[PDB]
Write a protein that binds this DNA or RNA. Structure first.
Lengths: 101, 206, 151
RNA sequence: GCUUGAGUCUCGUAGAGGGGGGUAGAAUUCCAGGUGUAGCGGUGAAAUGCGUAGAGAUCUGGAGGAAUACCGGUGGCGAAGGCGGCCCCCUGGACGAAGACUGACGCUCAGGUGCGAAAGCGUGGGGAGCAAACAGGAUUAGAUACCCUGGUAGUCCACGCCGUAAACGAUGUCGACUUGGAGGUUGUGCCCUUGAGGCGUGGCUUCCGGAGCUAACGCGUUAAGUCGACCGCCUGGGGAGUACGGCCGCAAGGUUAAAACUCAAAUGAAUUGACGGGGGCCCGCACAAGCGGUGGAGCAUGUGGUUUAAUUCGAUGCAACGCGAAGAACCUUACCUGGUCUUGACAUCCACGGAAGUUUUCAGAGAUGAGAAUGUGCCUUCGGGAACCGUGAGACAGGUGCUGCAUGGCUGUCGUCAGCUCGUGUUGUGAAAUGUUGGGUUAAGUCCCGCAACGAGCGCAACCCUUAUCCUUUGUUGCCAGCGGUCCGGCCGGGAACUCAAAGGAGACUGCCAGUGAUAAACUGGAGGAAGGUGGGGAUGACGUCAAGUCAUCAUGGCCCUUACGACCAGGGCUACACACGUGCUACAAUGGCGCAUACAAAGAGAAGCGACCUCGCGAGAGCAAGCGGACCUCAUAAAGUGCGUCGUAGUCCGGAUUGGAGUCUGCAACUCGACUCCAUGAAGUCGGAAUCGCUAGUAAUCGUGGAUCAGAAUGCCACGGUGAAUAC
């Protein structure tokens, strides 16, 4: 990392900031996933459109502006309240981490 | 007509010279023309042998011709009568006591002289050009070859107008001077006229 | 000048009087890259100017050049599809640059013997502002005075 | 029969709905009068026009006609055309609230009838402004136009006609159903009206959008969606909505409405590009700011034309025109005129003879012919082979012959412009789109940020050469600071410091600081430093464009000549000259000319070569001839500069063309047709018309020097240094 240049090393590190914040969570996936859980249906219509394109079950918290496009499991909720999405993701992350164990 | 020859702009940078003798002005033309005769002869009489380069050097009144070829066995032959025959006639041409060596070009599909001679041979066996070019790019990219571009041109498939139709795969950084671009060129004398085959092979960045 | 705003290069001052003003005057007078010849002409001409007027060297030069500096000059616009000759205020460096160009040009026009006499007589004719460069200044000022209606 | 369709009644509401009549205020024009004075008006600029007979400006009074600022609003009303001050009279429709009544009375509609902008027509008025026609002025090549100054019908009123418009939401009428959002306008009901509120419920209307539809564009509860009723109309473009006939009309014309013939398209919407005298942003000696040129003169050289026996061929807007050609006396040379050869000048394979080779003579322009020696250079049951030369048949050889529009290769150019694409994904029926656009920034699709894109390639940048500073090494032929003497010259001993030479390193990256900026990219400024922001210069020229250039460098498909379009030779030509153009040189001078003295370079070349010194010649040069294949010797003195003297504004002591004479050198050979020298001659030219070109800093300008080609021939080309600007708003 310190090898041969300072400027290009800085360039490369900020490539790790850009590739790290864009491809953050998905970097250890190694497949395309078996479900999709979106937190806003109209703000993230692209991901819903692709998971419908590929046959992936979409789990969306829609709001009253959103559209149940191809969301297989719609949830009428509130997309932009932090209390609501921390309660909401708290429940979802609670039920994910029960496999057969 | 606008690109520099990508061997000539790399002559002191990465590529070497195919003649490496020193000579003063009295014998520079004579040594040079003697090199035209030994490369002309030795190119004609090894047409089947798939010869890549022939490097001349003159250490003190004696020639030292090195034949970079892909099939060294057909150059040497059953016990090397063909080699001693060739140095006999090269000693006839240059007028000096001749030595001769054979360097084996392994990986012959990464050498542009051999690729252009291959595609040229296929074009004068009347095969379609897209197969020759496309096969050449595929099997050259298969072994190393960080880039390759082939470019045939001129009345292709026996037309009445002349096209080019080049192909390339990978990276061929031709303005970069530290790029090891192996470029060479052949001509295919078909029954419709000449078809020009150029091929650039990018091997490495230094 | 399309993009590039520029600096300016610094000229060496005059080797006799330390005057960058007069150094630019010997550069305006110089032809064919011959600077020695031009500074000989300027030293001879201003030396006889200082001897004639009796003042001093570069205040006789500064008076004779103060009478030929333009105030405002005309300038073409071509904005509304028409040719206007608008009057515009001259910058000081351009002011004395035009002064020297008119003195030198009018001195090349004269019919005396040597260039030092043509230019010594031209600066002397500009000291009481009756020469040719003052007619160039009055001509410029008639153009900018006639066309005053554009500002 | 019945009321949910249609209609009637009651009460209100809003409205440029219509028709008739009246009135008001601003303004324009005209008339009369006061003041007042030299212009007014008009245009891109002008002129026609009005004006000292008093205009325009200004004030007062009057007349007359038309239109009705502000309100004024994708506001309203009307079936549509359309309707805009205010008031009255007559009058049509719409909508709303509750209730009552009739009881299917409804919807559409061919023919028919009515209404129907504007222009136009008829009769009679009116006539301020505006304005077809018209006239004048300009503009222009012309200008029956646009622009200007006037100006009649007309526009206005009454009555009649016409009967059409892009009469258009290019969307027939009536009814039903089908997600939404924001408004506007006009009613009405309910609730603390606790205000310019809250909740509903109708009528009309505007914008955006969902499903759906649509070729797409778009339409989208006011449908171009989903249906039903009735009507109108369409059937390729042109001919042609024309001709003939009918009906209507005062007429203009309107309406209904063909055919022959002719084309293979015409068309719609959208896509990519190109273009625009469309818009936004940006660049380059593009313009501007400057300096010096070209076009004028003489000469050099190239071209067009003309000439010629031939004036070889090629290149022709930019990107042909000292271009191919880095060098035509013969050669080169391809052309012309003659003289000649035919397996050939150049090949390969045969068969025979002879080693080849070397000095001779005659004829002719050379090669063909005639002789004398030398011939065995090494092997062959000899029938020959190595090398070379004649002879004979050939298969062939040969072609700078044609086609660059059959090709390769190489090149120019847009342009060192910043662009050109691809894979995967997505969007669109699709051509294609996205990425590549957008906010900043950059020299730069540079870099950041954003974003249905994620990435990648060619290009940009960097790596390369050179230049600018320092260090290390080595120190000759190169250098001489300190030493010693010195023929005072690095000259010698010597010194390796320094210049320098050449190899290896360091160095410059927005690295540091301050400020501005999305805390990002970056920009502006500062320090240090030889250098500061791609430091200067070069090399490097993306995908493609011009069926650009070359078949004559070469290679090459096809065609063509093969006793000739091949080959050899001598002489000629490519150098011709009424002319025209391009690119240069030298000038027109005093910032100079001439004479004398004197200072400071860099880069190169050199053996069939560069050629010192010395002697001779006024000079070009000649003779003898060292040294050097070269940091050593030679080319080789740099010149502008400077210091003196002279010339004195003259076609002159400018300028050197042209021409006569006399020569030197190279080369078989300077006549056509070299270069240079000496003496003499001494044109044109006094700063160049329209127009046009180059240059942004060691630049332009100006001054010399070298080299390639080359026996000799540069004012060209390619390099090198000296002095050294102006200007950029």
């Amino acid at each position: 990392f310190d090898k041969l240049t300072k400027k290009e090393a800085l360039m490369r590190t900020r490539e790790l900031e850009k590739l790290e914040n864009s491809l953050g969570g998905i970097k250890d996936m190694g497949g395309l996933p078996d479900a999709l859980f979106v937190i806003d249906a109209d703000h993230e219509h692209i991901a819903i459109k692709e998971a419908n394109n590929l046959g992936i079950p979409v789990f969306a918290i829609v709001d009253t502006n959103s559209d149940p496009d191809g969301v297989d499991f719609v949830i009428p909720g509130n997309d932009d309240a932090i209390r609501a999405v921390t309660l909401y993701l708290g429940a979802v992350a609670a039920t994910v981490r029960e496999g057969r164990s | 007509g606008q690109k520099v020859h990508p061997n000539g702009i790399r002559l002191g940078i990465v590529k070497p010279w195919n003649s490496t003798w020193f000579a003063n002005t009295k014998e520079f033309a004579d040594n040079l023309d003697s090199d035209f005769k030994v490369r002309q002869y030795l190119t004609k009489e090894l047409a089947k042998a798939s010869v890549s380069r022939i490097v001349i050097e003159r250490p003190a009144k004696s020639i030292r011709v090195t034949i970079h070829t892909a099939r060294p066995g057909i150059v040497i032959g059953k016990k090397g009568e063909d080699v001693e025959k060739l140095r006999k006639v090269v000693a006839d041409i240059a007028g000096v006591p001749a030595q001769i060596n054979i360097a084996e070009v392994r990986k012959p599909e990464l050498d542009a002289k051999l690729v252009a001679d291959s595609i040229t041979s296929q074009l004068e066996r009347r095969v379609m050009f897209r197969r020759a070019m496309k096969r050449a790019v595929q099997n050259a990219m298969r072994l190393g070859a960080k880039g390759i571009k082939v470019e045939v041109s001129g009345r292709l498939g026996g037309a009445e107008i002349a096209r080019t139709e080049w192909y390339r795969e990978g990276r061929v950084p031709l303005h970069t001077l530290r790029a090891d671009i192996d470029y060479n060129t052949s001509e295919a004398h078909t029954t419709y006229g000449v078809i020009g085959v150029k091929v650039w092979i990018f091997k490495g960045e230094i | 000048p399309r993009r590039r705003v520029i600096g300016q290069r610094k000229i060496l001052p005059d080797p006799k009087f330390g005057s960058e003003l007069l150094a630019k005057f010997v550069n305006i007078l110089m032809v064919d890259g011959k600077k020695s010849t031009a500074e000989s002409i300027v030293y001879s001409a201003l030396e006889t100017l200082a001897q004639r007027s009796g003042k001093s060297e570069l205040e006789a030069f500064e008076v004779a050049l103060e009478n030929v500096r333009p105030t405002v000059e005309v300038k073409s616009r071509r904005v509304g599809g028409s040719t206007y000759q608008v009057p515009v205020e001259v910058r000081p460096v351009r002011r004395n640059a035009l002064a020297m160009r008119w003195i030198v040009e009018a001195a090349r026009k004269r019919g005396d013997k040597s260039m030092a006499l043509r230019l010594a007589n031209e600066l002397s004719d500009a000291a009481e502002n009756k020469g040719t460069a003052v007619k160039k200044r009055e001509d410029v000022h008639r153009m900018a005075e006639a066309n005053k209606a554009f500002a």
